[PDB]
Design a protein around this ligand. Sequence first.
Ligand SMILES: Nc1cc2c3c(cccc3c1NC(=O)c1ccc(F)cc1)CC2
Ligand SMILES: Nc1cc2c3c(cccc3c1NC(=O)c1ccc(F)cc1)CC2
Ligand SMILES: Nc1cc2c3c(cccc3c1NC(=O)c1ccc(F)cc1)CC2
Ligand SMILES: Nc1cc2c3c(cccc3c1NC(=O)c1ccc(F)cc1)CC2
Lengths: 327, 327, 327, 327, 143, 143, 143, 143
Amino acid sequence: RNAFYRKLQNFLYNVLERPRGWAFIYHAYVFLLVFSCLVLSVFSTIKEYEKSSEGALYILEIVTIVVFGVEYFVRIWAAGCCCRYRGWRGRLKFARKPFCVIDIMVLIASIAVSALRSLRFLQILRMIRMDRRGGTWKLLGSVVYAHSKELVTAWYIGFLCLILASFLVYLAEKGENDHFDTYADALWWGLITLTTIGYGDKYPQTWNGRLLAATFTLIGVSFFALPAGILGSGFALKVQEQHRQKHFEKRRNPAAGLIQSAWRFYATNVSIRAVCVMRFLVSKRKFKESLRPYDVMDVIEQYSAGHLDMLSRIKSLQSRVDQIVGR
Amino acid sequence: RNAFYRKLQNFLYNVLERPRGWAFIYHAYVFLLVFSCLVLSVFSTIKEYEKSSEGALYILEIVTIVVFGVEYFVRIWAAGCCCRYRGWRGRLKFARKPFCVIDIMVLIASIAVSALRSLRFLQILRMIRMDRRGGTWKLLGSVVYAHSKELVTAWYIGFLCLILASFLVYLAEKGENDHFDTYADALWWGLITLTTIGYGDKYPQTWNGRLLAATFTLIGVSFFALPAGILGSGFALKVQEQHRQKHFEKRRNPAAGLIQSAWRFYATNVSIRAVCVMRFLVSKRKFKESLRPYDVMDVIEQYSAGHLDMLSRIKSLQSRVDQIVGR
Amino acid sequence: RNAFYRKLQNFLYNVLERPRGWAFIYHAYVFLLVFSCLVLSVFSTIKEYEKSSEGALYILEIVTIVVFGVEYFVRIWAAGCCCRYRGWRGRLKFARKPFCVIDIMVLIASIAVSALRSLRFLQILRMIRMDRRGGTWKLLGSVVYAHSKELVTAWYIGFLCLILASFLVYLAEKGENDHFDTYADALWWGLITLTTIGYGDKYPQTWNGRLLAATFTLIGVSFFALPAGILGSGFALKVQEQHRQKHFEKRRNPAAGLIQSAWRFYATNVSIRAVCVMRFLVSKRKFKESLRPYDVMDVIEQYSAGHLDMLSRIKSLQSRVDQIVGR
Amino acid sequence: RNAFYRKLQNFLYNVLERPRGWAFIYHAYVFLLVFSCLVLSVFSTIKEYEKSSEGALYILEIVTIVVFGVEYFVRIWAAGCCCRYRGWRGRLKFARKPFCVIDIMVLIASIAVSALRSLRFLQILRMIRMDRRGGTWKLLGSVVYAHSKELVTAWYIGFLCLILASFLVYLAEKGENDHFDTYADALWWGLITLTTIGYGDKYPQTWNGRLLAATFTLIGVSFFALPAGILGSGFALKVQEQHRQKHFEKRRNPAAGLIQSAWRFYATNVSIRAVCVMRFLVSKRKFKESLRPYDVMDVIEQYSAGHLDMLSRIKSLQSRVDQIVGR
Amino acid sequence: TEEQIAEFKEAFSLFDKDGDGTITTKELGTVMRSLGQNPTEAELQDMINEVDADGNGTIDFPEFLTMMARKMKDTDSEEEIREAFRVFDKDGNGYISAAELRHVMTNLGEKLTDEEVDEMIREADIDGDGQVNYEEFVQMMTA
Amino acid sequence: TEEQIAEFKEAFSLFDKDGDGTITTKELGTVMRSLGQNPTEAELQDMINEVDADGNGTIDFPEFLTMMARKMKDTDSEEEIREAFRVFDKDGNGYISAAELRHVMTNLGEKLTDEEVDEMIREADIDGDGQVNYEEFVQMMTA
Amino acid sequence: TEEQIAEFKEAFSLFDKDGDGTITTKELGTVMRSLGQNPTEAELQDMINEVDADGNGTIDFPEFLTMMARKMKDTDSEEEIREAFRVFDKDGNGYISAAELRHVMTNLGEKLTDEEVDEMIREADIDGDGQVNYEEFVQMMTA
Amino acid sequence: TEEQIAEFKEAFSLFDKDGDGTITTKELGTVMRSLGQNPTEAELQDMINEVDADGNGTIDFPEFLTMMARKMKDTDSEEEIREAFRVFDKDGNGYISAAELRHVMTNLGEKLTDEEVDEMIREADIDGDGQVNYEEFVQMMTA
Ligand SMILES: Nc1cc2c3c(cccc3c1NC(=O)c1ccc(F)cc1)CC2
Ligand SMILES: Nc1cc2c3c(cccc3c1NC(=O)c1ccc(F)cc1)CC2
Ligand SMILES: Nc1cc2c3c(cccc3c1NC(=O)c1ccc(F)cc1)CC2
Ligand SMILES: Nc1cc2c3c(cccc3c1NC(=O)c1ccc(F)cc1)CC2
């Protein structure tokens, strides 16, 4: 029953590795399971709830270790679906994946288990391992890079405003207020107020201080809130762009051309061969040039191609009418 | 006077059920009326204002019950406009609607009236019933789903930043600060500061704590503010899209084709019948394919159709000029 | 020198009334002048700075009254530029403008001057009068109306979250925390925390309270921040739309047609008259149909017109080639 | 080896002046270096850490002065690449640049070094000099100017809401609350609450105060958060526009025409000359009209040109078919 | 049944002029022209894709027979026509006047002769109120 | 009046060549060509929709008479022409020079002969200041 | 080698009809037509830019020889074809059926005769599982 | 001067074939065709708007004389050509090689004969470094 064996291996690889549908339910389940361990550890930190929290946490962590071990074994087994990871050589190369070795370290350390500090560190490490593909980090980095200049503008001007406001309020409040006795305390106040956190541990009391704080909050608060707004709008616009580009989806014909071209090139193994290789180059360029823009540039280019085509047809018709005139 | 009876029934159904214009005035009136009951209950909770608040609340709640009863009865009566709910059978099926039964439960419990806790719970339940169509929930869910990946990125990285910053500040302030005596207190501080709530009950005091808090606020505050910005931009972009799509509105001809096709299909009750059913299929596909994109994809498709059609015409003219050449 | 008189009257009307360039400098000057009076009044409220603040405020307010009087007189005089306001009748009708009578009331009350309370009220009234055109209110109302459904969704769900979180935390903290002794105090805490104001006067202390506060802040804070983000994105998108629409500016030819049509209609004062009036109707419809869309709908309509026209030309060429075939 | 000399001079000018790639690494290095001096100064302000902070800061500042001096000298030397700054005259004119003279003042004052106050002022001055091109300020000013009307609407209405809410809460809390004893204190509270800073030093306590504070926070918080959202969305939209416009890049042919036109004009030194100068004018107009729109206006104009062209061709074909009819 | 199979085979033979049990676009177009209607390339390809469940561009006899086997109720178009008429239900009350119905049927979408609309009103004016219902209409259509 | 009704009927008869009291697009186009101007399909359909208050594409005599009955003031176009001129009031002061007025009237929108603009200035140069007003202008035309 | 150089020169001479060691677009088009294929202006210019590393629009013999010198592995197209087939790997499991493979080969992009696809399956059905792999496929292709 | 005025009048007479002191689009096009170049409607109208400071579409002799009076420096095009060449200054260093300069001049924008580029390099290769500067270039042209 090797057919059903392979089918099940494929299904398990689909679930454990990139899921699309209700395998997200399993992934969220294992998440919630580790998150529950984290929360129970947090409660175990408290002395009053130490006993019950520890009692539940022992079993919850043992279940976590069992599930992580079984999942890791099933993952390494189901990696066989991809031909890259076949046999012992291929599967060991699969274990070379950074997240696989990280997961192995997780299991080893957990079975081995500053004990509480180490437990907290390893909980954080499990959580970061949760991603396992880098999608979130890649997306965030992409959007940040896209808006690098605006983010840097916000950072620079907001930092300047923070420094200036903190120094001015320090000058106005150095003596009359216990809070701003050193420039560092004034900087702490400025950072905590421009972020709108406002702990209230420090705040100006002299009229100079309150006036300057008002006129500099009315600037710094907006500057510190900017990056969040910039990134949010960038994310929303990117979502809209992905939604639009999902429609036209013009990656098909270039791919067919490229694959048929490679097949012919292998079949080609002097002028006919020159034509074969040149058309293979043409197919490759079509593939990449379809890959590159993937946006309204294609639409504008299609408009231009249609326009020039119709002008050429116009010239042909003019030539025909002229020839009829001559005839 | 059954004609005026039906006209008034239709008007009342339009008002009570989906309104468009100044029936929103009545809906806002009944809202304000229940909201006033809620506020008066809140004031009744206070001992000092217990007497006057209770005195007003008795009459306000009795008026609420009267208006809700009359509105429910008028709604069940006016549901007759829709043929689906006709006669006792149809109107009883209408009462099967979840919000109708919820409203009945509201009336029964109110007339029946942990008394204060129950009153608060039922006020909340009335408020949730206020929607009665799920429009707000559906819209919010749609926009959240559209940006699911970005929201998950923000959630994941912001949660990681919260955990890391809380642990680092706890380490830096475990002994020297009374606030961070347990990891749970440090996590409370981290959550309250990254949200920019900043109660001020906890805040770092050691230089390690303040430094780490600064460098991790300058990240966590933006991450926690992101989801709001992402959703706001998504909502605004969706509004702009609805405004644009409101113009072209190309659902007319496909619908006319579909209804005429169904009429013919009924009239059709061998090759003529095959043509009739096949063209009915054509009409159905036209209807759905008009339904699906409802966006700029329609414009691009129209561009493609125009381009290919004009190219075909060009070929026709080329053939004609060639034939003239031959002649 | 009536020509220079009229030229100067026009220039002053342009400055005082709708300005475009460096008349904004004068408007900002008079603003700053009234704002300085407001700030000096604020300082006069303080006992310690009462003397100096009052001393400066006397002269600053007298200067304010002088400038407001001269500006009002110059405005009523320069309203003569518009032929609507000519002679005593026209200028009196101009004085009928709500902001003109508001300015008259301001001047009368100021010369007449709960004295401090009245002064504060009149300062607020001057500030609101500052607009004098309703532009800010109209713009804000327009953008709010555009996103009415999204704003209502945010309001509704955020209010529900506030009520639910406040009640749950009240239940969890009714006894163990001095802050939440009445439901009203819990609601105050919920409103102050979900807005991210976080006064810190109230905050949960029991583990139930802190847990529920965390899970409900992670929702309410975003919901309360939504409206700001929605409106900000709406404003930015509207700005982008205005920038785009500023280019094509297709209001010229319809207006020329309409004015020439009205001139002809006056000149027309039976079949010729029928054509004249009917073409006047055509011109009016062209004017309005140019007014209405003012967006990409025009562009799509132009595309459609070009398409259908070229298809008609194609039909003409097909007919010609067919006739040649016959010949 | 003047060739390698010039090559190295060009590379150094590229690095020090406008960089594109990994020269940003050097710029970030010198930034971090000055930022470290700032932080060490902040720590030197504290008495407890005065000794170690001063000890490190001496050497760090000396290194800063050395690096700034060498960088300034290398910059003045490498400015020779641009022909504008050649020889002593050109390089001295280069030193006329505002940032070059600012940098010279920086070195002079540092070597010369209210000593601590002067040091803080000069640290701020170095930081502002960091930009050296005004890019951040220009970008921020551009985006603010684009949304000037929306920002002014937010400012105006939010300021009115602040004034009104502060006065109302002052009235409601003048006697019963120690915080609001003067209108200035109430205004301080209003500014600190509508910004969502919420120090908690002042907050309403009477039921009037809490009610009014609730209903006015639910407005002022959004108004004060608006400008951040507006600017963030503006920045994101501008980024999207730059990304789109980066594609077509149509500035090539107009520039080629303009330069060839100028060459011909110089060569031209009567009807032939008239043609030369008129075509030079044509080239100049093409260049500028290409510079101006740089947006979708180009696409719409191209559509219009293609349309009118094809209609003219249609007329030509109609004339030809008519002539054939006659023949 | 046997008569249905024989008549379907005769209709197919009139359709697939090639005689190889494969109705192509050209033969469908020719039979359509014989019937009078003029099908375009888009119409023909949409038609074939609608009937072609294999993807070869031609239909075999069992495919045609099974597509014909679908009845009014088996089509499950009740919801589709319901929403379509709702789109045509301008007021949304659940009814539409005779004049508006005639206008939309004759002059929008596919133009169709007045005899067909007269027949539809004849077989649909159960109550003859002018504002004739469409919900029970489509219910009896599917039945 | 009776004379107005008779002249309107004569004009309609010259319009509706069919003689069935239904002015169609073709007859309107032919009469317009006889008048000299060339109306396009878009112009013809916009016109017919402007006059056709029923939707059948043809106009009966009472409809033509009632649309003709509208006077200058009854049209309530004062606001429309006022705002149009404001659009043409470049400065916005309430006046426009003779040269700019002539240019905009002759060379923008619909091209019209110089005699018409000469007549308009003759009947409108109440003050003859060059920068002739348009507000009182439109008031007097509407009256 | 010497034989390779001579055969390349003969092919070029058949290409550059001008005989000046500069293959132009017109000569490429003529030889393409002789071969049967019809190259368009876009195809011709894309090809010339692909081969023209100088920018003069014509190719000299050493350029032709050096572009021909590239082998299957030297092209470094393994990644390109890998991702292309992945795009054609609908499921993403790493395999594709014979029917879908033939459909994409002969009915999408550039239509290719059935003989070529038959030959590819003949030389590629190492296991003959229908769901034939493409990774080892392309590995052997590049080798 | 007097000779300049007379020669300008002769050139205008060759331009305005009408003889009424009003150079129209048709006459400009005819003289352009005589010169060899073919001006399009867009080019003709752009030119006329460039010269027509009144807006009547035709130019009188004083207008032609005053536009011709402009010299190289009076044009104030130094900044325009400076920025244009900067656009053509790919590296931005302030210099451009001879090969790239020739390519951009001959093959982009307006195609111009090789004699003109040879003459420009002859009159511009002050240093003959290949990477010839453009700043002093434009300074010397403007002078
Ligand atoms: N919000 C915000 C404000 C300011 C910052 C300053 C310096 C550095 C970072 C930030 C800073 N942090 C981000 O913008 C951010 C967001 C998301 C992310 F992933 C990384 C950084 C001065 C003012
Ligand atoms: N804002 C915000 C930040 C963070 C969150 C984290 C985990 C879960 C939710 C949120 C979280 N909540 C929403 O984003 C949200 C908004 C609207 C809505 F309807 C539901 C959830 C970590 C950081
Ligand atoms: N922000 C914000 C949140 C919430 C609100 C709720 C009820 C009413 C208003 C708001 C409310 N206020 C606005 O959205 C707003 C903004 C601008 C403006 F002009 C008017 C209202 C529940 C949660
Ligand atoms: N946020 C914010 C709110 C309010 C303001 C008021 C008056 C003046 C400025 C602001 C004000 N400041 C900015 O909007 C801003 C942002 C960025 C920048 F560069 C300059 C100003 C009333 C309410």
